[PDB]
Design a protein around this ligand. Sequence first.
Ligand SMILES: NC(=O)C1=CN([C@@H]2O[C@H](COP(=O)(O)OP(=O)(O)OC[C@H]3O[C@@H](n4cnc5c(N)ncnc54)[C@H](OP(=O)(O)O)[C@@H]3O)[C@@H](O)[C@H]2O)C=CC1
Ligand code: SF4
Ligand code: SF4
Ligand code: SF4
Ligand SMILES: [Zn+2]
Lengths: 96, 342, 209, 155, 48, 176, 146, 115
Amino acid sequence: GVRTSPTGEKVTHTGQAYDDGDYRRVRFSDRQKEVNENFAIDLIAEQPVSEVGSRVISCDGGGGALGHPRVYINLDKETKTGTCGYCGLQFRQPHH
Amino acid sequence: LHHALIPHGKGGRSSVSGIVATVFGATGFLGRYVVNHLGRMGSQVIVPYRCEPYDTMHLRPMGDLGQIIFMEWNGKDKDSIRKVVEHSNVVINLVGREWETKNFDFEDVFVKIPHAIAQVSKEAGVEKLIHISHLNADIKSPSRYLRSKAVGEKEVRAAFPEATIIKPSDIFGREDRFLNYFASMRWFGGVPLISLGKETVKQPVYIVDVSKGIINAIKDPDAKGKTFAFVGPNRYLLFDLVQYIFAVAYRPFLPYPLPHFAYRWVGRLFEVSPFEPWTTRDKVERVHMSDMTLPHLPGLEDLGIQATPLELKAIEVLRRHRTYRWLTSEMEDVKPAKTVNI
Amino acid sequence: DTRPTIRPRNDVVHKQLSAFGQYVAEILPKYVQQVQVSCFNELEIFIHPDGVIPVLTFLRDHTNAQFKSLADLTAVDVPTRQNRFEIVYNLLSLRFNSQIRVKTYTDELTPIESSVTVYKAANWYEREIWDMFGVFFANHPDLRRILTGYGFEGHPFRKDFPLSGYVELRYDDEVKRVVAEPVELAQEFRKFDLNSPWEAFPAYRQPPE
Amino acid sequence: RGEYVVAKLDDLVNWARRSSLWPMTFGLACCAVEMMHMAAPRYDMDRFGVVFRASPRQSDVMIVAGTLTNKMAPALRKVYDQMPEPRYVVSMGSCANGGGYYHYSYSVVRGCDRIVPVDIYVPGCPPTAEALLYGILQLQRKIKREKRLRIWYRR
Amino acid sequence: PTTKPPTARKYIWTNHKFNVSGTPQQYVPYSTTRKKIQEWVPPSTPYK
Amino acid sequence: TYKFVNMREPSMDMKSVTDRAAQTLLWTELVRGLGMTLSYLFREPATINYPFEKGPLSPRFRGEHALRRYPSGEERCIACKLCEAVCPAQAITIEAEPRADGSRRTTRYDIDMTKCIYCGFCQEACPVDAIVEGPNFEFSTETHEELLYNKEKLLNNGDKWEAEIAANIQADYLYR
Amino acid sequence: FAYDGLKRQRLTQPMIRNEKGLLTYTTWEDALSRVAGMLQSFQGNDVAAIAGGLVDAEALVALKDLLNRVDSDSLCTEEVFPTAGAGTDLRSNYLLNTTIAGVEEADVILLVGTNPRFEAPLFNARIRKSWLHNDLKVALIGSPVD
Amino acid sequence: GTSVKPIFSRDMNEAKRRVRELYRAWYREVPNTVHLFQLDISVKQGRDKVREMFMKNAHVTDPRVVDLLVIKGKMELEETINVWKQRTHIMRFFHETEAPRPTDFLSKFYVGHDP
Ligand SMILES: NC(=O)C1=CN([C@@H]2O[C@H](COP(=O)(O)OP(=O)(O)OC[C@H]3O[C@@H](n4cnc5c(N)ncnc54)[C@H](OP(=O)(O)O)[C@@H]3O)[C@@H](O)[C@H]2O)C=CC1
Ligand code: SF4
Ligand code: SF4
Ligand code: SF4
Ligand SMILES: [Zn+2]
């Protein structure tokens, strides 16, 4: 998804927002402020949470050679669900 | 001042000065140079344009990338001006046609659109305005040029109380339509100056002088509401320029007096051309009109610019009109015209 | 090679070049300060600034050397040395398919008499070493600028000269002519300090100083 | 009305101007040999209606192709000056576009547009021959969308 | 692709577009970061 | 070994000189040229019909850059900052920032097309194949500004050419 | 970790009071014009200065002479050193005459009215190191702080 | 240390002797270069400008250094008279396009935070 600034000015995922005057805005006049509609933060947050019953699970990210450097994230934290750094998708152990 | 408008850099091309110009009708003679001076320290101009972008192509290499934006704008439309002046620290007006047009008249180009841009600029929230008029702009002057300039002048002044006003005497430069206009008279035999042009005095102004005078006025905080007038260092009789610029062009000097009514007849005949007329009745009697000497109005010396002599920067422009037999002739051969002191 | 990763060495050329190093050494003990044959069978003749004609003329006409091919001559501006410049000729021998390197030290002011007489290939090979570095070459036909711009100021290859220089051009429409201004970049050079703090190959480590 | 008549007259001039331009490639660097490569029978500009023409008083579009140095700077501008109108310059390669690989060196002006009014910027290092051919196609499309006679009608 | 359809993704552009240069839906560069040095907010109401 | 290229032995018999005189008088070798080019004309041309057909390319082609994302859709980029460190023209500028989730990616990935030189080192540099550079080459423009690609522009282009580059690295990652 | 404080509520432009008496950003011109007239019209004890917590010695000297150029001597600072006795006269009175690098060899140290854990953490680190090795006897009077 | 090589001149006396006639050449050329290069500046400002760059380095005492600018300055008068340089190459000395740089302490302070 994507939100809109008071000047309309669809705010990108980073949070950029030209304020009211901000003479630099004139470059978007007669043109379009290129913004990617797909926002990474909420486009991965809704992804299903993996349920694997092990303490350590690899996180190659699908297609080991084609994916990302395989990590060995720990699965013992029950407060929150441990996720790969590169992948971002979340691993949780079912009742550990 | 806004956080994004704090000036920086050494006044170079990619330096930021915090001034946001919106020069109007810059696709002309003096609009060319001010933008060139505007891009010197990196002031993002907007330069709304109405002609083909190709004719506006030559303005790109006067500023860093993204510093010279181009916006399509129509004078008759109202929202067209507003769409380019919302985010401008200053607004500079230079719109003006030196001849009559079917779709635009002297009144339309000198009171209609300068008042309109001034009122939206004040409405938008601009901080300054530089509306240029003529030093010779008299409400009851015979020329339609000067009377139209005068009525618009009080119009913009009333619309914008703080609108600094520039009235240069006469502009001479590379394509001034003033020096080259006199040089172009060779193709039509002798010079058709009425009564030998012995009864007309002018004080021309260099482009670099006036164009600089704009942004010194911009950077000066005391220029709000002033009515600066720019004049050259020396005045000269009309017959005193003609032979001088002919001599500095080394063209055959052939003065030829003729009646003014026939001079008007020639001006009207040249107006019938559907394309750009070579001369019009307005400039016919504008040439023989003599500038004032009013000293009460502040000059370019007030801001801190010295008015360069006409004879000094003349070789750059009149060299083109010379033939092969004088293309390499220096200005030592010519001599400065007989200045009329004040 | 039992170790295909490492590059094989050749001692046959190595000590033969070492033998030739002493050969030239004994002939001119007034010029040859230093002779060195590196690991990769490269011979170096460190000479005195006065010797640009004799040793090169020696290396060019001798029966046992026959080095008539001027491969290149280059300077190595080393600030920490009292003689910042280091002019490095390179010679090639058709008869013995070998390469000879000779080095001479120099300050900014000390001149080198031109080697045009020895190698006439060197005519154009000083017009840029004078340009890039600023070492003037004495008694030379022409010392003109051929790499730097017409009337450019400085010697850019000097290690104290900035990457971006000082002058940047732009076509100024006020004067209808390209003109120079003090340089100001759109982005400055994001220099990187990539020298690891842990010592490299200890073979060439500097002695306790 | 007059608008329709002037529209046809503008198109008549438009069609030739977008089909009869004669480029002059100011051969500078490795970008230049690519333009000679799209002179090869593989691409053959001349099938579109453009010919490699020297004497830049005859050419309409001129192509900077490679790095541009201060030494090359003033002469290159003069080539643009007496180049007759209509005149368009196409930036070939990253070095001509924005200095490219030598953007930080002391001797090359960053970007060719600092000297001439670039019309089309063609990215590449080098731009593959047909990528420039694409840029030339874009030039004619831009040439198609002009209102020279139309603007004069409202002038 | 009629015989080897490309792998489907949620984010793949459903409608491919041509080059948009010279047209009102052009691309215009703009800094994507956020302003870091913020001014001291001037307080309001009193004096001395 | 070697061979000579111009050691010529013109035989001075009355026979041979007749050919030499025949060669000079009747422009035989010049006629050879005429018949040579005539055979070329009688052959087909090889001018490809652009844009109705374009040049033959390869899966390893280096073109316009485009940042991609995982099958889940989150950006592959993790701001390891390798690509700009090897970028031979310093066209890659980037600053990482904390993110709300904690998967702190970059707020800036700006590649200057007019400075970049399309070596492809960025692909080899990226450990997660985030920055690849696609097969497109039509990304010409008319203003210098639109070549200063930013994080949004790369992300949009990655979502555009995702159908193509995904198969390209699919058919080439074994080589890499 | 204090670089973030560098980026918070940063004074950026000449901040002067408006017609109401409220701070606004204006050019330099009015800012030093306001100070110039008020400093020249007044003369003597009626003009003075208050030093802060972190000020370079450059600015302290810069207006020490300026305050004297307007005939003022009350150049005051936040922290108070009793002027009774030598005070600012003798350097030793307000000086670590032993030097921080020279505290290791000391045997019995008497800390008076201070909590070096937070007053001078680095100095507390130095005495702790000498405490561990040199086996000195630390002694502080006042609140039983750690 | 003190003993050193005479690149072209032993003594500062002959250093000026190399400056003199080179100035004479760098004095004589002005009317012809201003003529064929087709400039707008007058001869006299060319003359006094020639003085200007003869001035800034009129403060060195090492004979090698001064006569190194002699050959250095020897290296443009022919670069000009054989029309090798350009109009943009000798207007460059006539620094014109930049606004006057600030001289007073107030002007530097107003412009920015840079000595
Ligand atoms: N000596 C002199 O000539 C002096 C002149 N002035 C005044 O300066 C002004 C500008 O002079 P200069 O720049 O030399 O003139 P030019 O004729 O060279 O340029 C005039 C500019 O005005 C624009 N313009 C005119 N009418 C319209 C319109 N109806 N809608 C939109 N744009 C319009 C033109 O657009 P486009 O390029 O598309 O035609 C052009 O950009 C004039 O008002 C003139 O009287 C002041 C002092 C002296
Ligand atoms: S852009 Fe690349 S290919 Fe073109 S001239 Fe520069 S370095 Fe060579
Ligand atoms: S190909 Fe990648 S690494 Fe190489 S210059 Fe371009 S952006 Fe930088
Ligand atoms: S694109 Fe790849 S190489 Fe570049 S910063 Fe992101 S993860 Fe690192
Ligand atoms: Zn993972």
